[PDB]
């Protein structure tokens, strides 16, 4: 189906306690495959998926150069932003940068995006045309002007429309055995009495990849969204995900409630009951 190559970069100042902490992570779809952390034992770009361990020293060198350069520019950006907002040299501040390219199911470029945040909210955003920027306030307006002066959108558009697409294809080949594998959920229901006349039904989905899933409870074959407790999809730690949904029902009526599971890995949507 659709695929995406995305990165998340975070730089956090720590006045008096060193250069800002800088962490970069790359994902293909829901799979992390690289990281750069300037506090790590090896503060370079390194593999974080098994299928990247073969890549060769030229790749790590180019990515380390790029990441180091990004950390340096972000360090400067944090100083500049302090100046724009008239903030003290004493506080910790955060600069975040996210970018990605997305291919549709037909294999072709669908969309690219790129955004910056300062202290946890939008700062500067690349427009959908990939040719211009939106600034949140008069500070980011200065950043927009500098980007215009330096034709920064041209550099970002070449990356998103070309380089990003090219490497996404390469990474999908290198990691195909796991990136293209759909792993369906293993599902079951648990049942626990909660009062003299009620019980919890909990519908579990375990061990699935990718993360996208729909878990719902129905009562007599109709929607029951308002009365369902849902947890956020959470990582198992082995590259698969988990989720559950629970409802509280009258004792003796369990059989009228059905759990419905939709996931790309299932031949057909599944239903389970107690």
């Amino acid at each position: 189906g659709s695929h995406s190559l995305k990165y998340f970069h975070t730089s956090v100042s720590r006045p008096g306690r060193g250069e800002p902490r800088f962490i970069s992570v790359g994902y293909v779809d829901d799979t992390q495959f690289v990281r750069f952390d300037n506090d790590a034992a090896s503060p370079r770009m390194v593999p974080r998926a098994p299928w990247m361990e073969q890549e060769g020293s030229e790749y790590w060198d180019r990515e380390t150069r790029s990441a180091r350069d990004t950390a340096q520019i972000f360090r400067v950006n944090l100083r500049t932003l302090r100046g724009y907002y008239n903030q003290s040299e004493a506080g910790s501040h955060t600069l975040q940068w996210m970018h990605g390219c997305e291919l549709g199911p037909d294999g072709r470029f669908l969309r690219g995006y790129e955004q910056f945040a300062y202290d946890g909210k939008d700062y500067l955003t690349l427009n959908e045309d990939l040719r211009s920027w939106t600034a949140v306030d008069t500070a980011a307006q200065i950043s927009e002007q500098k980007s215009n002066d330096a034709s920064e959108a041209e550099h970002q558009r070449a990356y998103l429309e070309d380089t990003c697409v090219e490497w996404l294809h390469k990474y999908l080949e290198k990691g195909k055995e796991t990136l293209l594998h759909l792993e369906p959920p293993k599902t079951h229901v648990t049942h626990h009495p909660i009062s003299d006349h009620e019980a919890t039904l909990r519908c579990w989905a375990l061990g699935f990849y990718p993360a996208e899933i729909t878990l719902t409870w129905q009562q007599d074959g109709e929607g029951h969204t308002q009365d369902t407790e849902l947890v956020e999809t959470r990582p198992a730690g082995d590259g698969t995900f988990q989720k559950w949904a629970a409802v509280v029902v009258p004792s003796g009526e369990e059989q009228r409630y059905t759990c419905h599971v939709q996931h790309e890995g299932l031949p057909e949507p599944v239903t389970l009951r107690w």
Binding site: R62, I73, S143, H155, Y159
Partner: peptide
Amino acid sequence: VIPLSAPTL
């Protein structure tokens, strides 16, 4: 890979 240009703000 990551972009070869990181924007200056």
